[PDB]
Symmetry: C3
Subunit: 532 residues, 3 copies
């Protein structure tokens, strides 16, 4: 029939139907819907403003650009995380505040299906929404899937520490996309009364941040963090952020007389000029030559006084905030291959010794945040075993993963629980067939592996076994049920214990079964070690 | 006496008194009155905004700049259409939103004289208001004459097809200046309740557009289109305008990743950079090599969705719309010398044959928009007459004139007529003594020839025979009478029948008398041909 | 016990304590508090906009930058006027709208002490607030002292003479600071209901202008003009100013097609570019050859139609406005050494004859504004006496001093008196030990010599004698009493008569006592000569 045409507040939107195998009702897809005014010129380094309305019918049938980022790194991550057959090459632009919608609802009628907003990851430096296709999830579980984008790197996170540039522009874009949904999603057969935000990695941490922010209050009703939370140090800048702002400005060829002078100067810079600055800063690579405490991994989240009134530690410590069902999960080997490879980690010999371990762990300061006085003990706790240099390197990775995702995730889960809100945890342990060739088959539950089950990659790509297909059908149902009742459980699916005092979590993989006290031991150790 | 000082909404304006040979009543003249804020910087490619108010008295005693255009092309047209003796040298600037006023009213007393607002032509690419002196008309028929300006070329008509740059900036200016008139004319002895708009060529097509625009309603009560209407295709863009925008962005050295990207980039360019882009484009000149269907004649009117909700063809269909007295006229030989000479036509030998005719007609695509399979029938219907190559060249010029003005003008008139509103038509056939020395004396009723009678050139220049002086007097009468009563008739003047079903019109010239069915046979042929 | 933290409408401010010998209660100092939004980008050449509120605690413990100016000239004047022991070197920046506060109040309690707002001088081309340390005056007279800054030169006074750039930006900033004081001063223990503005030189003229401006109505309750008033021609521009605008524009490398075009262009220029333009104009210096009337001193105050509705002459002619106690004073030798030296006067021979003098006075047209036909007359009235060139040189200095400050000051005073408001006058006659070596010891009461006494330099620098100390205590007490009651009289002080019909004034110096009719003779004379 005639392409799908939905009416929104700003104007009519045109899309295209896409039927999936085994589903009569085709899925309506809208690509590149603007949810905010293009942040160009004077709007750079400022909160997102509403999108100007249009006079006729807007054709939303073309993938939007991805926010300015390292094009090589961007395309690489996309190819590794995409759930669709062939990766979709994208263009770069500052005009990237768009979102993609996938509704399996029959627009001719009135439907109120649950809405699931996806926040992509990429360390807040790279990524896009187009990378994730929701055609499968939307059909198999009959939910309206929405993928959003937000300013990355300098454009979405540059902060001078004061009012001239508070920061968190990227986080504000997410909040704006959430309001867009509350105001228009009903036009796509989605129930604005039931919105679930979920994201992986930096997207995960973003979810945690939104769950603690007063600005997002009432913009969602359930949240899910996949391998990433607000306690994930590397993504949250604590202390005086001024030194960073100046370092960036100097590189860009700007004076540092005052804050307003820097912001003004940086606004004058071109996109290419700021992309070059980015490349020079080398944000997603382990800095070897230099002091570990001087390596700037990124311009993560900050305490601007708007989105976040104080550090995540401080905020969660209190129990006076709108609580919602929150699902926090991690993978078996978060630091298995993906992250180390991208960051170009030194580990290439396949083995390591205490001395070298403590040497590498040190330079990993901008990631784990371990005082040089805690290096020995930390290394001993994980490598103080077998003489096998090879088995050491493996325990070294588990060492890093526990500090970045493991312990943090569990902590957030505990606090949310104590806050008196429905909490859930899981430990994904599986090795997708879509993995990379360079990835050693001895790795399972790597960073981002759960993505393929979540977005039903086995229903779009080819070569998926019946075992890999069912696993996905299970995850999608678990997720979708949560978006529906704030409870993953359902008929035909194993039992998922709510993370309470017993601290029971679900283990997903070849064999999905419940368990208890995830990393419980690991947490204890670090909680004391970190206490100096 | 002392310089006239009128009080307007945004401040007091100072002018000067000028006396015309024989008239005791001195005419108050104001030059350079702003009717909007200068469309500089971010205000480029945006609607005109109200002008900021001034403190003391503003000297409105100097000619304003003409809108940025091809300085050479603009200077030529100014010297070929000016009715004043010596041609005034103008300056270029994006700061060109001014209007000139000519009032014979006695400012010392309340006066409600009819107001005639003039809209200059020039293919929407060149032109200016200072070119036309309103002294003679204002004094002879006692009416306030107002010449207005509007953004041209890229500045006034650049459109990306969407909300990022809808377009028709130039027409919105025409509207702004009209609202200004309704708000201030009374202070100049003019009656806002009786404003007549009239223009020639592009100024004519503009009147035709305002007559059809829901925004213009109530800003004028009488319309006059001299050689140019909404059906003159060359000036109206249909279909996706996105290609033209992208071609312009590229020529200016801008990326085309998205609409917003283009507009932002172009807004960062200097006036001169856009003027160089203009010259590079080579607009008003016939392209003889390439593809006629791709040739870009100019940047005209589009369907923004604010000024025009749909194409003129569809608009004139409806009856449910406000209607006013409309006078549509054309010249004997619209494609006689002027236009061809300006666009550099291959016509130099002074004759033409059937074979070279069909070829030329095709390259003339951007003007007559005639299919390539229709060329044979069209050429045979006009040139199949005699075997005289010279007559074939003249009958070929009649071909282009009919398609660009003849047929369009009549169709527009018949629609206004059947719409239930007073309509009037005429055909000017005379050769002013103010013609160029380069125009053959055999050309009678060439494009723009009426302008000399309309603006009483015979009373400002020299060499005008009494016969020509007489023609001018009659013309200004009819006009002013039409302005006064929406009817040209008045004792002392030949009778001008209303354009009703008998399709009676007036032939102006040495011998002025009525006739019937103007271009009747012509309209039939062209409507039937295009039907295929 | 802990750094001073104060809450304001815009956010928290953090200062520092500084104790002054003789006072138990340490003074709370706040440096660099923003009272407006940085006048950058499109904000240049526009009214000051409110400052953006900050989220946490802002540290105002660092000296703010001074507005862009001649770095050399700026730093020189600061060392010559500074009352602190060591001159503080400052940075330049368009982001200069800050104010400094010195409060002797105990912020742990509720206090409401009189507020004295200082407006530094420097011909509206240079100067800073930081130059003046309020520590002494604040502690000694128990009053809150506020030092403000305002846009200088082109940035603060560029006028096209119309609505596209009225001018007086620098005066608007001063008014913007006064509003900030009324909204937040109570947080600093200040009494918003008792604000006294005072300034020296261009600061004196500013105060004088604020007294005639409707915009300053109810923003201060007492005024003090030290050596400068609104009748000091040199700082006030009369007549068409457009010619000056164009002159700057061309120098800066801009077009001059229209006013809007000129302002649009200058806004594009970088700080460094406008600064280089400043240095080129040679604003401070004096041209010895050419034509005196073709020179150009500066960009003083203009008649914008906002800040000032008409010339100070016309405005003071009316007794229709808010009348507040006004104190106007001058020094013994206004043109004794300081100004001449800074402009580089050819008086490097210490001698001057009746013929060489008539030449200088003419060349000094932009400073005295005297028709060349009058030069001979005036020159006689002063130098027509002794045949001693050495005395002629001195009498010549008295000539200029009387025309710039002497006569203007008394006239301004008398008019205020006749308006029926409290008036007072004084004449400082002392030679501060904190003078410059290169300064002749025969010069007593040079321009700005009262500043050392007013700001208590004897209590900040070293070597002051018991006499110089006593003088400073007396002056401060006099100023503080005036701020308190609008009357300088108090116990322990001589009697300062009001400026009624007897025209009594105070002779401040080593021997302070009252007198009558200040410059009465000179006032009568000049008024006559100028009557031509
Ligand atoms: C690259 C591209 O095709 N641009 C298209 C854009 C984009 O879809 C939107 O900017 C969101 O991507 O808008 C249209 O689709 C539309 O509204 O009619 C037309 C145009 O073809
Ligand atoms: C370039 C130039 O000379 N500017 C002139 C302008 C123009 O009138 C307006 O810009 C409209 O052109 O304003 C004046 O006339 C005026 O109001 O006193 C002064 C001046 O003569
Ligand atoms: C570069 C500079 O000196 N500016 C400084 C400003 C100024 O103190 C205020 O803006 C008043 O001028 O704020 C800081 O001191 C601060 O709040 O800690 C840090 C910053 O470095
Ligand atoms: C892309 N990798 C390169 C070539 C193949 C693959 C394994 C090898 O890595 C190592 O020896 C590391 O020690 C390592 C890294 C990541 C996971 C396991 C082991 C280096
Ligand atoms: C300067 N002109 C050149 C040589 C003489 C004169 C007429 C001719 O004109 C044309 O071919 C035109 O196409 C034309 C103009 C006007 C009337 C008829 C035909 C070409
Ligand atoms: C260096 N100066 C020389 C010798 C001592 C001192 C004073 C004198 O000049 C004057 O008295 C002039 O009045 C003057 C001219 C220029 C600058 C400052 C003072 C000339
Ligand atoms: C390409 C490099 C991609 C960066 C994404 C991996 C880092 C994840 C994280 O820091 O949370
Ligand atoms: C069929 C109706 C015919 C009128 C259209 C004529 C084309 C106009 C033009 O080429 O400018
Ligand atoms: C160094 C330049 C400083 C100029 C300051 C002197 C005051 C000038 C004046 O009052 O006209
Ligand atoms: C928009 O889509 C419609 C229907 O698919 C099509 O007719 C039109 O050409 C498209 N417009 C664009 C973006 O070219
Ligand atoms: C504020 O000042 C304190 C010291 O007084 C300093 O430690 C801190 O860095 C400043 N705040 C910031 C982050 O600007
Ligand atoms: C405009 O004319 C008036 C009338 O004397 C004059 O005051 C003003 O300066 C003139 N403008 C210019 C810049 O020529
Ligand atoms: F991430
Ligand atoms: F035209
Ligand atoms: F000064």
């Amino acid at each position: 029939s005639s392409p799908p045409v939905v009416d929104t507040v700003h104007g009519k939107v045109l899309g295209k139907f896409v039927s999936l195998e085994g589903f009569a009702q085709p899925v309506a897809i809208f690509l590149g819907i603007p949810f905010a005014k293009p942040p160009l010129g004077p709007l750079r380094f400022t909160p997102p403003q509403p999108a100007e309305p249009w006079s006729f019918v807007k054709n939303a049938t073309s993938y939007p650009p991805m926010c300015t980022q390292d094009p090589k790194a961007g395309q690489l991550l996309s190819e590794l995380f995409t759930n669709r057959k062939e990766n979709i090459p994208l263009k770069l632009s500052e005009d990237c505040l768009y979102l993609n919608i996938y509704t399996p609802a029959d627009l001719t009628k009135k439907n109120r299906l649950p809405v699931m907003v996806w926040i992509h990851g990429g360390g807040l430096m790279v990524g896009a929404a187009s990378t994730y296709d929701g055609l499968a999830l939307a059909a198999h579980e009959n939910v309206v899937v929405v993928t959003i984008q937000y300013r990355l790197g300098i454009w979405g996170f540059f902060s001078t520490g004061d009012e001239h540039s508070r920061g968190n522009w990227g986080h504000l874009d997410q909040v704006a996309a959430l309001r867009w949904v509350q105001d228009n999603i009903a036009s796509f057969g989605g129930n604005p009364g039931s919105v679930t935000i979920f994201g992986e990695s930096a997207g995960g941490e973003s979810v945690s941040v939104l769950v603690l922010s007063p600005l997002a209050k009432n913009l969602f009703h359930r949240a899910i963090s996949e391998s990433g939370v607000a306690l994930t140090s590397v993504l949250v800048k604590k202390g005086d952020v001024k030194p960073l702002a100046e370092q960036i400005a100097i590189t860009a060829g700007c004076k540092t007389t005052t804050s307003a002078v820097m912001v003004h100067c940086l606004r004058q810079k071109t996109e290419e000029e700021l992309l070059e600055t980015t490349l020079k800063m080398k944000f997603l690579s382990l800095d070897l030559q230099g002091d570990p405490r001087e390596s700037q991994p990124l311009l993560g989240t900050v305490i601007d006084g708007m989105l976040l009134l104080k550090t995540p530690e401080e905020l969660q410590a209190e129990r006076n905030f709108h609580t919602v069902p929150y699902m926090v999960g991690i993978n078996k080997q978060e630091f298995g291959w993906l992250i180390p490879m991208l960051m170009s980690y030194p580990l290439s010999e396949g083995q390591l010794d205490q001395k070298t371990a403590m040497s590498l762990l040190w330079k990993s300061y901008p990631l784990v945040c371990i005082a040089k006085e805690l290096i020995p003990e930390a290394t001993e706790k994980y490598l103080g075993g077998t003489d096998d240099t090879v088995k050491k390197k493996d325990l070294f990775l588990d060492l890093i993963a526990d500090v970045m995702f493991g312990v943090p995730s569990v902590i957030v889960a505990r606090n949310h629980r104590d806050a008196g809100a429905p909490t859930y945890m899981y430990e994904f342990q599986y090795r997708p067939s879509f993995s990379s060739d360079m990835k050693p088959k001895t790795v399972i539950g790597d960073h981002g592996d759960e993505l393929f089950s979540v977005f039903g990659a086995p229903f779009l790509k080819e070569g998926a076994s019946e075992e890999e297909i069912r696993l996905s059908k299970m995850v999608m149902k678990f997720w979708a049920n949560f978006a529906r009742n704030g409870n993953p459980n359902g008929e035909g699916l194993p039992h998922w214990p709510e993370y309470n005092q017993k601290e029971g979590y679900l283990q997903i993989g070849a064999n999905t079964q419940a368990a208890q006290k995830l990393k419980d031991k690991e947490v204890a150790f670090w909680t004391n070690l970190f206490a100096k």
